[PDB]
Amino acid sequence: VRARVISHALKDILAEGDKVIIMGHKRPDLDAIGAAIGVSRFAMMNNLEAYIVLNETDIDPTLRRVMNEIDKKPELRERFITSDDAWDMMTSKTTVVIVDTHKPELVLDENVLNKANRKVVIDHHRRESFISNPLLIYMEPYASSTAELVTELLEYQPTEQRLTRLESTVMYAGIIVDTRNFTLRTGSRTFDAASYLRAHGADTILTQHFLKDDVDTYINRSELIRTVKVEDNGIAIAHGSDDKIYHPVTVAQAADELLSLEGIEASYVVARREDNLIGISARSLGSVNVQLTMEALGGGGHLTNAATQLKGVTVEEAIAQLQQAITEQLSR
Amino acid sequence: VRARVISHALKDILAEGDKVIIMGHKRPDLDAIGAAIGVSRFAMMNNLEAYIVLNETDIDPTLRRVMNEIDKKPELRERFITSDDAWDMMTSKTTVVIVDTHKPELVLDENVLNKANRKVVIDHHRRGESFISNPLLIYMEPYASSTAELVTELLEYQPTEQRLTRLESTVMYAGIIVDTRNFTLRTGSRTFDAASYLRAHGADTILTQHFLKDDVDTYINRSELIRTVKVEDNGIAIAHGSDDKIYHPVTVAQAADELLSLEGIEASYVVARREDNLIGISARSLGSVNVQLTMEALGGGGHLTNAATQLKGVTVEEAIAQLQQAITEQLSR
Ligand SMILES: Nc1nc2c(ncn2[C@@H]2O[C@@H]3COP(=O)(O)O[C@H]4[C@@H](O)[C@H](n5cnc6c(=O)[nH]c(N)nc65)O[C@@H]4COP(=O)(O)O[C@H]3[C@H]2O)c(=O)[nH]1
Ligand SMILES: Nc1nc2c(ncn2[C@@H]2O[C@@H]3COP(=O)(O)O[C@H]4[C@@H](O)[C@H](n5cnc6c(=O)[nH]c(N)nc65)O[C@@H]4COP(=O)(O)O[C@H]3[C@H]2O)c(=O)[nH]1
Ligand SMILES: [Mn+2]
Ligand SMILES: [Mn+2]
């Protein structure tokens, strides 16, 4: 429906410009990069000239692995340009496309954004702040990702110049990342888009390769997990020893990983973050609402994803406050 | 369409028999069960009479978790019958459908098969020497992900008044997940089309996660093999269990497997006390390093990516040593 008209409607909004320039959000992830690459391709399909804005300093380790493939094995590189090159090349008929974000403060380059007279916003979140006077707004909160939304727009244009395998892989990876391998916000349309991409060469094992965790993170993550106590009621608590500082990501990951073990519906992981700060990551399948649990300990978030931080306490005191909160939350 | 043709042809063959009996392979997995279920929904969509064969001895831990949900929908629970119930109700007009196998000695009940007059076969394996005798229809597709994927396609072309239920599509979806290791093996656009169809009918991802939860204890175990690894610069990794401890062959195989999922690892070698006298080596590789050669050269063997060996007498630290030496060997040309 929307996806039907908006596709053709925007090859027109794009047909009316010298070039098209694409920007994601700062610290681009694979949804951002894949969505941009898609749109890149969507424009090329109408022989429109397209470039994606990326600076050396935006490219993190995960993205770095991607870009190495992009240099070693295609000609995808040459469509990536710096902020400067973007500015020094855009007129006022140049269409800027914003993918995977809607707040201007978050756009990869607010200057390249502000300069452009013709703005379009493709994002899959819900709407305060927002881009000024956009020629079009494709906001669809129920998609899994921006890469999904762009995938189903590709399916209307000149079938001629097809998605490369590699472009497909990266779009695919963005979907994998945002859905956690098809376990979150996945609808039939996610699978429709995954079908389309896989039809065009999307490599699942290369996708695995971009995403692989490292040894030390596994080891550190499992240190927390081997301490878990699971209650009959499905609540599970793991912890780090009070004398050891854990990186807050491996704590978040531990909490996630536990949701994949039998009998665990909600996970809480407690570990020293700083010299006088304890962190707790909470996670659930949706039966237990871990937002309430974190809010009652000074944190917050969403029903299945939440966290909090506590100062001055030892690991054991925070666990105590944690149990107090849980037993209070699930008294019946 | 081919599947449209097959769908419609199967409708005739099922309707002209007097009822349908559905049977997968021995120690059925979620795919065989998902597939059988889909076939029984297919039948119902044409007010045919369908039964799935399943004995209580034929239900592993995973499957029991699944039957636990099925018991809540009597309509669905009542479709499953035992080998006996099945034999005593077969006639000459009864049509038996084999799912997820094509090998007569792999069928769940050889007896029920042998009494079968009218037969159908749907599988995603490739033909071996043996084969179901004189089937009325054959829907094999060696490149598909699962029999659940194939059955799913056939479903798409039938009356939709009494649709595939939420619970039915969930089990079929689970079969696809097990067979493809969560869309990481032998997955194709058609696999995603099946998945989309299933998901459109309420296939529940959380419940599927439930069916497939790992054992806490076994996570921790596999964890302390992986915890031990040392990865050389060339991407060869070596993990070991203590020699005083003893590990399940599956814990070991899983550790070696799960090491490949880590960054910068081309090949894994896990080594742990397999008995009291014996030591075990599991070896895996992305596809580059030649774990076969390494293992063959230790009185073992397997395949380029998946090989292994056992060594009786030695103790781990020396088994590790024999590994280093054999590796150092094929490595330096
Ligand atoms: N009201 C309130 N809410 C809070 C507070 N602290 C955290 N939250 C909220 O609760 C969410 C829980 O994630 P986290 O456990 O703190 O843990 C962090 C972080 O450790 C985790 N994370 C970061 N990178 C990764 C990753 O590569 N993988 C995984 N599995 N998790 C990651 O996700 C979280 C960060 O993302 P967020 O979207 O911000 O998601 C946060 C955030 O929305 C707080 O003091 N007050
Ligand atoms: N020449 C020679 N070849 C050998 C020897 N041992 C194994 N092989 C061959 O190479 C494969 C290596 O797997 P494994 O590490 O020994 O590990 C074992 C076993 O631990 C593992 N396994 C057992 N259960 C499971 C399971 O539920 N899941 C998974 N992923 N693996 C399992 O699969 C392997 C056994 O099944 P196979 O299909 O036969 O797979 C074997 C077998 O084909 C040997 O001593 N000499
Ligand atoms: Mn993003
Ligand atoms: Mn996104």
Ligand SMILES: [Mn+2]
């Ligand atoms: Mn199968």
